[PDB]
Design a protein around this ligand. Structure first.
Ligand SMILES: Nc1nc2c(ncn2[C@@H]2O[C@H](COP(=O)(O)OP(=O)(O)O)[C@@H](O)[C@H]2O)c(=O)[nH]1
Ligand SMILES: Nc1nc2c(ncn2[C@@H]2O[C@H](COP(=O)(O)OP(=O)(O)O)[C@@H](O)[C@H]2O)c(=O)[nH]1
Ligand SMILES: O=P(O)(O)OC[C@H]1O[C@@H](n2cnc3c(OP(=O)(O)O)ncnc32)C[C@@H]1O
Ligand SMILES: O=P(O)(O)OC[C@H]1O[C@@H](n2cnc3c(OP(=O)(O)O)ncnc32)C[C@@H]1O
Ligand SMILES: O=CN(O)CC(=O)O
Ligand SMILES: O=CN(O)CC(=O)O
Ligand SMILES: [Mg+2]
Ligand SMILES: [Mg+2]
Lengths: 431, 431
């Protein structure tokens, strides 16, 4: 179909950035619909690396108009920092990026709050990226938050900013005993980039509606992953937005009935950065192997990622929540050399029951044990293979099993960080 | 289709409760996906009235399983209050109601906070229903909020409740100078109903997925209305949840691609309860007429509702945001006796431009003027008419014009508060 959603079926870092950059060759628009700069999407073109955070992954293509939708919490600072970094590399961001006036603004005090809250949790810290994401979504739903639209009146903005900061600082100092955030500083930093930021404003809801009516190709790019979903993830160890497919509509304004295909980015194994339940987590040599071979370190915080086997129980939950149309199996090449590979096919509950369904809130995942199916690995190299024909049978079997267990086909297979180290068996845009 | 969404295309109170109760005769499930008890849905069967708030509008049908989805903020108090009221009237709520463990809990301190925040806004008060809705969504996205799932461990719950209340009370007394909320009282009130509440818990995401695979008829019932949407409504004069169609997926767990038909409940004229922009608002005799004839008073707060002409510009925004399949025109009977009727077809911006599109944030609606198309009214009574044949031509013309202006057909016409005072031209379930 014309409207394709690319999102993470696990705990993020599945390879959304690459696949979005890969598939947008035919797209007219690329749209981020939730999250903020907590995301870290890595693109590699002819060996050249690019890490995006707030800026959509279609920014490297000039035929594409990248769009930061209303569902996104936007940090003017982060935007300018990335804009300048990309512009110095020949990417004219301002010319291909548009954003929603309904976007909530992330400012310094949000970060201070983020840090304070994480501190107060002590050993039970969520392990946020400390980018102020949570607090920004909080001011939004509370209805005191600032939005891009507020910037259109420099005067009234300063007033609104002043009272909201008086509100937060009171808490930062009196309740948390932390430094206060300077009103004037935040006002100046923001005012220094107001004209640039506002010149990219557009009515995204309307734009996407017109694009749909014209049959334009639109790609929605998700951030984080399904199990980090504020509603359906391992609460409270989740992000504060809806990472699941439903967030596409709320975060862009496109009517939900206009989603044609949902592509789940599925990593051949599992990773998680931040605290929280991880049934198939490995602490042995294999885990260490995955981390090393997969270069698993947060593209945003650089923190070492927790590793584990692919979890079919957890992935099946992602199938139903996102009404997945197909998967894109990534980093299959990272498993090369393993004597055997395992995939969780069931959970052994603390009371002894065997289930094929996942617990909701984090607490409920306690004591849950993974039940594995063990398959033969392969010594052959699959790195960069662009044809299923060039893959070992053990790998094909592993692929087929995943499909059988999930009931969803694997339409794309990635064998390397580069845009071309991939094999598209079925393109979402014409499927 | 099998999955039909019924939601408000305006500012709420369009008549969602009636139409849901009307159409669920063929439904297996009815699902609320956002909001809380701030909603007020009025059902009238053979003259008998029922006002629901938290409880879905399919509760009066025994063949229907009502479901409070995860997107809903749930007040244990409100639930029990409604449960007992309905049970004393022969409606065995506990036997036909199921709810999500992922639902955030609304407790007394949320109400206190709600009241405090509204006080702090002074003359710029949002005009919330003071039910604690906003604060509950705030604790949720912040990830400190309590959920139905937490109730499964009475011990750990008290601990979690204790620390979150210490957090909020600090603010209530030190920052707002308001009374504190008693921890023990909240703990006892909640514990007094824990067993009842938890006995209705079910995995809603999974349930709806199985129901979809079986082809069961599912009706999603929205609360509030499109322009009250936290993202797309007249911010900050909106509710704190996504009232638009996209909220169906995030608030229930059903994959977005599984929405078959979206039915927009459209009142023949406009009403708004709470502060905020209202372009076609009438302060004359006609406005007073609408209020009186339409018995316009919040079914939840009893507050007099602001009235005005039907706004096609604002409604068109609802068309695209919700990817509407059709409308259900309600309270056509309330216009009987008017010499002429008007419908806004364009906006005159403050700078002089004529536009057919709506402003986003409230501030941006300032100075906006409505441009009307005036049509002849009708003296004939349309109350209770169950056949389009029994409607005056002027009414048919008014109906056709609405369709022409919006590009969406009016599949149902309501002519009275009773379930039967209606005419279904096309049923969403088989259309
Ligand atoms: N070996 C290998 N690396 C890949 C593949 N696809 C992506 N990567 C790399 O894996 C990492 C994924 O992290 P990240 O970019 O945070 O994923 P995202 O957050 O989903 O965009 C990046 O460093 C990519 O360059 C693949 O198929 N094979
Ligand atoms: N005259 C008339 N009243 C109606 C009709 N449909 C519903 N009502 C009444 O209009 C009111 C609508 O308010 P409310 O129930 O809050 O609407 P909701 O919040 O969308 O469910 C109720 O008192 C209904 O009984 C209709 O077609 N005609
Ligand atoms: O900062 P936060 O409040 O969102 O942290 C809350 C939890 O969310 C985790 N986190 C946040 N963003 C991403 C991420 O984004 P990507 O690159 O788009 O896939 N990939 C992986 N993990 C992520 C870290 C915390 O446990
Ligand atoms: O209490 P709140 O925070 O949601 O108030 C924020 C604003 O939302 C308005 N409000 C809330 N719920 C409803 C409503 O629900 P219904 O019966 O389902 O249609 N119908 C009409 N207006 C409503 C009142 C405030 O301006
Ligand atoms: O690329 C995003 N993450 O992995 C998050 C982080 O770096 O913490
Ligand atoms: O029926 C719901 N509303 O009208 C809200 C209120 O009563 O304030
Ligand atoms: Mg990443
Ligand atoms: Mg109502």
């Amino acid at each position: 179909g014309n409207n394709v959603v690319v999102l993470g079926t696990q705990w993020g870092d599945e390879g959304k950035g690459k696949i979005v950059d890969l598939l947008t060759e035919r797209a007219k628009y690329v749209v981020r619909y939730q999250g903020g700069h907590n995301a870290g999407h890595t693109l590699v073109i002819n060996g050249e690396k690019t890490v995006l955070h707030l800026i959509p992954s279609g920014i490297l293509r000039e035929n594409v108009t990248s769009i930061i939708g209303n569902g996104v919490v936007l940090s003017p600072a982060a935007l300018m920092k990335e804009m300048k970094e990309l512009e110095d590399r020949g990417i004219p961001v301002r010319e291909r990026l548009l954003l929603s006036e309904a976007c909530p603004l992330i400012l310094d005090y949000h970060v201070a709050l983020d840090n304070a809250r994480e501190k107060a949790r002590g050993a039970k810290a969520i392990g946020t990226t400390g980018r102020g994401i949570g607090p920004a979504y909080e001011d939004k739903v509370a209805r005191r938050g600032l939005r891009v639209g507020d910037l259109f009146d420099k005067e009234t903005f300063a007033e609104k900013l002043k009272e909201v900061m008086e509100y937060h600082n009171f808490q930062l100092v009196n309740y948390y005993k932390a430094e206060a955030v300077d009103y004037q500083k935040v006002l100046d930093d923001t005012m220094a980039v107001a004209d640039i930021l506002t010149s990219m404003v557009v009515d995204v809801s309307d734009l996407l509606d017109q694009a749909r009516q014209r049959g334009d190709f639109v790609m929605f790019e998700g951030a984080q992953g399904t199990l980090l979903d504020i509603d359906h993830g391992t609460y409270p160890y989740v992000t504060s937005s809806n990472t699941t497919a439903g967030g596409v509509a709320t975060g862009s304004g496109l009517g939900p009935r206009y989603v044609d295909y949902v592509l789940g980015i599925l990593k051949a194994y599992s990773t998680r950065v931040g605290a929280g339940p991880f049934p198939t987590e490995l602490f042995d040599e294999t885990g260490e192997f995955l981390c090393k071979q997969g270069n698993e370190f947060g593209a945003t915080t650089g923190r070492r990622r927790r590793t584990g086997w692919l979890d079919t129980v957890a992935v099946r939950r992602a199938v139903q929540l996102n009404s997945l149309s197909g998967f894109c199996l990534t980093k299959l090449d990272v498993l090369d050399g393993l004597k055997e590979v395992k995939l969780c096919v069931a959970y052994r509950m603390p009371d002894g029951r065997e289930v094929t369904t996942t617990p909701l809130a984090a607490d409920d995942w306690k004591g849950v044990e993974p039940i594995y199916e063990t398959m033969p690995g392969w010594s052959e190299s699959t790195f960069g293979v662009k044809d299923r024909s060039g893959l070992p049978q053990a790998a094909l079997n592993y692929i087929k099993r995943i499909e059988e267990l999930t009931g969803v086909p694997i339409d794309i297979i990635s064998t390397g960080p580069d845009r071309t180290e991939t094999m598209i068996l079925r393109d979402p845009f014409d499927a």
